[PDB]
Amino acid sequence: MNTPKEEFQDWPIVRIAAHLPDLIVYGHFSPERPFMDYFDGVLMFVDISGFTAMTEKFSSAMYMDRGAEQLVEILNYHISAIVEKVLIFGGDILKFAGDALLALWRVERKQLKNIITVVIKCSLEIHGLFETQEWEEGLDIRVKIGLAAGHISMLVFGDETHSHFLVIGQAVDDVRLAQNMAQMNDVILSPNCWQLCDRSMIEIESVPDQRAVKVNFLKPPPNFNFDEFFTKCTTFMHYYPSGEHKNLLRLACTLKPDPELEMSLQKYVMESILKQIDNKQLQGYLSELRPVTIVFVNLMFEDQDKAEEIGPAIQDAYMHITSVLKIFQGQINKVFMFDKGCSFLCVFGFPGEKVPDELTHALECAMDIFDFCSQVHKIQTVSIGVASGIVFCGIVGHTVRHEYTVIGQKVNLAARMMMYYPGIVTCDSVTYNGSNLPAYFFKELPKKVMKGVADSGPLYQYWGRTEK
Numbered sequence: 001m002n003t004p005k006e007e008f009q010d011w012p013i014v015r016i017a018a019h020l021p022d023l024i025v026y027g028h029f030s031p032e033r034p035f036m037d038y039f040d041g042v043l044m045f046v047d048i049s050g051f052t053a054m055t056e057k058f059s060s061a062m063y064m065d066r067g068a069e070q071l072v073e074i075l076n077y078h079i080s081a082i083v084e085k086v087l088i089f090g091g092d093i094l095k096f097a098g099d100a101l102l103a104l105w106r107v108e109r110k111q112l113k114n115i116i117t118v119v120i121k122c123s124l125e126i127h128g129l130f131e132t133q134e135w136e137e138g139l140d141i142r143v144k145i146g147l148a149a150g151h152i153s154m155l156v157f158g159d160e161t162h163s164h165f166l167v168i169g170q171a172v173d174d175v176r177l178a179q180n181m182a183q184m185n186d187v188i189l190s191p192n193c194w195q196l197c198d199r200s201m202i203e204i205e206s207v208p209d210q211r212a213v214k215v216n217f218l219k220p221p222p223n224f225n226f227d228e229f230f231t232k233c234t235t236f237m238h239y240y241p242s243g244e245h246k247n248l249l250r251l252a253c254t255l256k257p258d259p260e261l262e263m264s265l266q267k268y269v270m271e272s273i274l275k276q277i278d279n280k281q282l283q284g285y286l287s288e289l290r291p292v293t294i295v296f297v298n299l300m301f302e303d304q305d306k307a308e309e310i311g312p313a314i315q316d317a318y319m320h321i322t323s324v325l326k327i328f329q330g331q332i333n334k335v336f337m338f339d340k341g342c343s344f345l346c347v348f349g350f351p352g353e354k355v356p357d358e359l360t361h362a363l364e365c366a367m368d369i370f371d372f373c374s375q376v377h378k379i380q381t382v383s384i385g386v387a388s389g390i391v392f393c394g395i396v397g398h399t400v401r402h403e404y405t406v407i408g409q410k411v412n413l414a415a416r417m418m419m420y421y422p423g424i425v426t427c428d429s430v431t432y433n434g435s436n437l438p439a440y441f442f443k444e445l446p447k448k449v450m451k452g453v454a455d456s457g458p459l460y461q462y463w464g465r466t467e468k
């Protein structure tokens, strides 16, 4: 009696699970929005910001008309190898957002110490991927790694058809700060990660004027076997692929059709991604160098680590942001913490979502969002950065773990505008000149040197219709 091999694993539910972490896939949580969870873990923040420079050169006539295709191919080539490293070492990739990825090892407090060792070793094997890596003309493209450990809160917000999630708290703030201290090839530990770590495993040096530390070496004791050590650590990793599924990168590759789970998971994913997953759109349609308008929205709180305080406020802002964006096919691409505030990366003019008068609409939407969010209880400061131009749109990461992302100088510009000009609506020259709006709607701003952007162009505050 025959026994045919290889289980079918290309279900729509599996394709949707690629765009999500295990934190979501295996989350099983209540309907209420906002939803909040509290746990401990180790965070890894890998920065690959050599490619926001690569985006510009891929726009040139060199690449003929295959710049977006060549860019996503070389990106994913490198990011796939980082993803595979994180996954094999037992991490959950939470999020991709142009310039970086965030990974989680969610673990009970007693196991934090040993898991930090696992995460450090993973970090050093990531750097070793790029030791003699390059693309000939210009540079060599390497990574920067910040690590943190401690209390982590999760926020889930949304409505009946859309869901978004965020990690929040001191370890989230710390991993971002650790990453900003890092140079090319560094592994930085947050002060608390250093306080919790196995100090007899790791050789560090002092970071100037900083409580955070730099890993120089992993020097394991005489009788230490990393493979045996890792095997002991997998005891505490709920979803580590094992036994008959030991060949898999993600347990999520084994998800079976489940209408109720799929209904809940599809809400995290953009309708155009779902269409491609459903084989109703060509799988290359979403990789594009495309003119868009970025509306970057930042919401500041008195304490950005207390999810019970800020979760209701983000939900309230989300509900209004979503109603305003739908009007013009605006999309929330990502939500995440900056080093100060919760930020919504909103996009006008994504593939098949182009409206006429994109710029006038992006500006009126920004002001609407600004005015509402300014009246939301616990929102201390709203800042909105508006920038317009050619950006890269595409699915970034590994086959088993990928996300739709925007990358480009105009993405970085909108982000830097909202941090360097807090409390106002700002826009670039493209938005200002190409707005179908009169000059007195705007105030021409002083020029600030912005860490990441070279000649921004003239910047403007969107003042709005009246003097008041």
Ligand SMILES: O=C(O)c1cc2ccccc2o1
Binding pocket: 095, 096, 097, 098, 099, 100, 101, 102, 336, 337, 338
């Ligand atoms: O460039 C950033 O600030 C950035 C990238 C990123 C990736 C995952 C989660 C948060 C993130 O923030």
Ligand SMILES: [Cl-]
Binding pocket: 094, 095, 102, 165, 166, 167, 335, 336, 337
């Ligand atoms: Cl996040």
